[PDB]
Amino acid sequence: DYKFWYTQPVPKINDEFNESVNEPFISDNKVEDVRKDEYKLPPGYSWYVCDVKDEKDRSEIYTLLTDNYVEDDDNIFRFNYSAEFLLWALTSPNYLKTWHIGVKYDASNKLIGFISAIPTDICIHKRTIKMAEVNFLCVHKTLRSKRLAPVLIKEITRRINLENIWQAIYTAGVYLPKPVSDARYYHRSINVKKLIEIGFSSLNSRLTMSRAIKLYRVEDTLNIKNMRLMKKKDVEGVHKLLGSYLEQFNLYAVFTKEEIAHWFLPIENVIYTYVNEENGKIKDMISFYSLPSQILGNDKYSTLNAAYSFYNVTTTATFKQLMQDAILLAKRNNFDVFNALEVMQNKSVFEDLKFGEGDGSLKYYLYNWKCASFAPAHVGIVLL
Ligand SMILES: CCCCCCCCCCCCCC(=O)SCCNC(=O)CCNC(=O)[C@H](O)C(C)(C)COP(=O)(O)OP(=O)(O)OC[C@H]1O[C@@H](n2cnc3c(N)ncnc32)[C@H](O)[C@@H]1OP(=O)(O)O
Ligand SMILES: Cc1c(CCOc2ccc3ccccc3c2-c2ccnc(N3CCNCC3)c2)c(C(=O)N2CCOCC2)nn1C
Ligand SMILES: [Cl-]
Ligand SMILES: [Cl-]
Ligand SMILES: [Cl-]
Ligand SMILES: [Cl-]
Ligand SMILES: [Cl-]
């Protein structure tokens, strides 16, 4: 019925809008009128602002998500964001500590709920808007189905409105009111043996074990000879390359020089970025971040090291050759699989590069904004 979401400024389930519609639901808001008090919690619980730059607070969030975050439809995987990943995803330029919200069970002083947001400039249908990017909403498994998630959402909505920000962007695998775009995800096997032993990939008389190994074997030779790890000196070249590339889409982020350095400069086991420099110009780039999935119950393996496509731009080669090199670069760094969405130009290389369609899709949502839905090929942003 969507009893909570019906009260929020988002499209009703049966709402559509014209291409030309591109405006908020509620405008002319005043920070002065925002609630100054925290939303009440049940007796025995208290809000807790998290300092992600502190190892203890950061480790408390890690344990919460490690034990209670998203699982697949078959209950064999659970996302296992590393502590360093969370530090990277939450300390972007001009972040606010007050947007890293948790809830504690006072008796044990244990964290049981969390939600976060970061500020980002988002362009939607040619209009650049200051928005909040929400992520990492989690409620402990022992307290599910107790209307705790709406409180987390309402509280962080208040903290964001207190900063004079009234729009937000988020994604989720579940269907809510209402997606502006819906993108199926795909996977590219690398460690064929491991993906079979754990039961993710299948075999049959046509595709045997040995035939499957040969099929997904990758050549260890880059199509772009000079693709190398990104460095500080490349920030400006990437800013120009990526900025120019994203203007062709209906939904993307507008990066500053500072944001480019944060979101792309490589970090081991977190973010990988490679670039090709010709005549002192950055002409091609590849990027993918690391998000392992704990293998639930398996006594042999503990995690499935997955790599997720981020932002890839080529001006001197074909997109086919580019994503092909991305897979190899992920293989060289000991990743078991390469995952991507059908956004930007990704869909044009899935068949040729032997991707496999997954079970579900990822929906893109906007808070307090009216605009027409569009195909995922017009989406030019990837959230963590
Ligand atoms: C301008 C600033 C605005 C800022 C805010 C903008 C909006 C932010 C939106 C959040 C961005 C998320 C970004 C990410 O990280 S997406 C992935 C979210 N995380 C997980 O799935 C981890 C594992 N699962 C859980 O932790 C819990 O099951 C969660 C927390 C998901 C719900 O807890 P629980 O299962 O214990 O239920 P409840 O009794 O509290 O309450 C049920 C209500 O919650 C609505 N629900 C369920 N799942 C989601 C979902 N993924 N996004 C939004 N709403 C969701 C549902 O429609 C229902 O509403 P209604 O059907 O009654 O109406
Ligand atoms: C929930 C889950 C799943 C379901 C598959 O999920 C995929 C697969 C591919 C995606 C590609 C791009 C973007 C999102 C992709 C997603 C996806 C789907 C739904 N939500 C999210 N996230 C939460 C919201 N913010 C972004 C991240 C990601 C698996 C799993 O089967 N594999 C993961 C490891 O590689 C092999 C297979 N393991 N686990 C813990
Ligand atoms: Cl239209
Ligand atoms: Cl090479
Ligand atoms: Cl191209
Ligand atoms: Cl398929
Ligand atoms: Cl469209």
Author numbering: 27 to 410
Show me the paper's own sentences about this structure.
NMT cotranslationally transfers the myristate moiety of myristoyl-coenzyme A (MyrCoA) to Gly2 of protein substrates after removal of the N-terminal methionine.17−19P. vivax and P. falciparum express a single NMT protein, whereas human cells express two closely related isotypes, HsNMT1 and HsNMT2.20PvNMT and PfNMT have more than 80% shared identity, while the human orthologs are only about 40% identical in sequence to PvNMT and PfNMT. Small-molecule inhibitors bind both PvNMT and HsNMT1 in the peptide binding cleft, where residues contacting the ligands via side chain atoms share 100% sequence identity. The inhibitor binding site is located within the peptide binding cleft formed by the N- and C-terminal domains.
Compound 10b adds additional volume in the core A group via the naphthalene moiety. Tyr211 adopts the selective conformation described previously. However, the bulkiness of 10b causes an additional “vertical” displacement that relieves hypothetical clashes revealed through structural superpositions. There is an accompanying rotation of Phe105. The displacement of the pyrazole group of 10b causes a more significant outward shift of the Ab loop (observed at Asp98) and weakens the hydrogen bonding with Ser319. The morpholinomethanone group anchors to Asn365 via hydrogen bonding with the ether oxygen in all asymmetric unit chains, despite conformational variability observed within the morpholine ring itself. A second hypothesis is that the bulkiness of 10b introduces a number of additional binding site perturbations that have a compounded effect on selectivity. These include the more extensive movements observed at the inner wall (rise of Tyr211), Ab loop (outward displacement of Asp98), and “pommel horse” residue (rotation of Phe105).
